[PDB]
Amino acid sequence: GAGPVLFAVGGGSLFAIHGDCEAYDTRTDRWHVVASMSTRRARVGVAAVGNRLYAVGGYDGTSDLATVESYDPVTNTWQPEVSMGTRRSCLGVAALHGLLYSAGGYDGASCLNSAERYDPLTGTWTSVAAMSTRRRYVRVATLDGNLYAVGGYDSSSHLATVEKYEPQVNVWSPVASMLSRRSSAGVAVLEGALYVAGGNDGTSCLNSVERYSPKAGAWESVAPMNIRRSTHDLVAMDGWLYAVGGNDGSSSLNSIEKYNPRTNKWVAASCMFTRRSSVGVAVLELL
Ligand SMILES: [Cl-]
Ligand SMILES: [Cl-]
Ligand SMILES: [Cl-]
Ligand SMILES: [Cl-]
Ligand SMILES: [Cl-]
Ligand SMILES: [Cl-]
Ligand SMILES: [Cl-]
Ligand SMILES: [Cl-]
Ligand code: NA
Ligand code: NA
Ligand code: NA
Numbered sequence: 001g002a003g004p005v006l007f008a009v010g011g012g013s014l015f016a017i018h019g020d021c022e023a024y025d026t027r028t029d030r031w032h033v034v035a036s037m038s039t040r041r042a043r044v045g046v047a048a049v050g051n052r053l054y055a056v057g058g059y060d061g062t063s064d065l066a067t068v069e070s071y072d073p074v075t076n077t078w079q080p081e082v083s084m085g086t087r088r089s090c091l092g093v094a095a096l097h098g099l100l101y102s103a104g105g106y107d108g109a110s111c112l113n114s115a116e117r118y119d120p121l122t123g124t125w126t127s128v129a130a131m132s133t134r135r136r137y138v139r140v141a142t143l144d145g146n147l148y149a150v151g152g153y154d155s156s157s158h159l160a161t162v163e164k165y166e167p168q169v170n171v172w173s174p175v176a177s178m179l180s181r182r183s184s185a186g187v188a189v190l191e192g193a194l195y196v197a198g199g200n201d202g203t204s205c206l207n208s209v210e211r212y213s214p215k216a217g218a219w220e221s222v223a224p225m226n227i228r229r230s231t232h233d234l235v236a237m238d239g240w241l242y243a244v245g246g247n248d249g250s251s252s253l254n255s256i257e258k259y260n261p262r263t264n265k266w267v268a269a270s271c272m273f274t275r276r277s278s279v280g281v282a283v284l285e286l287l
Pocket of ligand 10 (some may be wrong): 214
């Protein structure tokens with residue numbers, strides 16, 4: 001065998017919030033329309049847990065959502081799940097030891113530093129230790145058994161700071177700060193390194209990319225993307241990085257580019273049907 005399939009869920013465009021979804025087949029470089037969600041969700045957290053898709057929170061054009069829904073690729077369908085304790089748009093979402101974490105975001109009034117976790121067996125959310133920082137527009141990714149919360153926006157500054165959640169003790173700890181301030185960046189783990197691509201640093205949309213090694217605890221610059229992207233998403237697929245959707249500062253992107261770390265190079269791929277900024281992305285193993 002089963003191969004990786006990329007899923008672009010929700011997002012927005014000019015004056016639009018999407019509920020539709022599409023899937024990218026790496027073998028054929030082709031996109032396929034898949035089941036639409038029950039709710040329109042942009043700025044949604046999307047994570048794969050148990051080879052099932054979870055769309056967490058988001059913004060439906062009027063409200064910041066607490067609701068969650070789930071995608072079954074076998075039947076190609078979505079279903080409701082238990083809602084979070086907080087409404088969260090612009091959040092980070094990741095899978096860790098089989099549990100689904102939601103960190104940071106915006107509840108309609110404040111930038112959140114809180115976090116909670118979902119056990120899909122019991123369908124239950126429990127709060128977890130809060131981050132040291134309010135992190136709107138945060139991204140979250142799992143590396144070596146820890147959660148990494150990357151950049152974001154407290155109510156006033158764009159952040160270059162990073163935290164990591166240790167679940168053995170339920171504690172957030174600082175991580176070396178990135179070389180750049182970034183909100184709405186794309187974040188993904190590839191061959192043991194945490195890649196952060198694009199984002200907005202408070203001044204412009206970024207095409208720069210950096211990566212973090214936990215062994216050293218150090219950040220290192222990497223080839224920039226071909227297109228400046230904020231609110232896009234980043235995912236690891238079959239040895240490559242895929243940067244999906246986002247915004248170049250004016251137009252919502254349907255563009256896709258992929259990063260080969262052996263050549264340190266970015267190359268375009270087949271673009272989506274829909275333009276999706278603040279899009280959720282995840283990878284399933286399917287055959
Ligand atoms: Cl399918
Ligand atoms: Cl976002
Ligand atoms: Cl890992
Ligand atoms: Cl700032
Ligand atoms: Cl600075
Ligand atoms: Cl990833
Ligand atoms: Cl390859
Ligand atoms: Cl375009
Ligand atoms: Na806990
Ligand atoms: Na270290
Ligand atoms: Na490839």
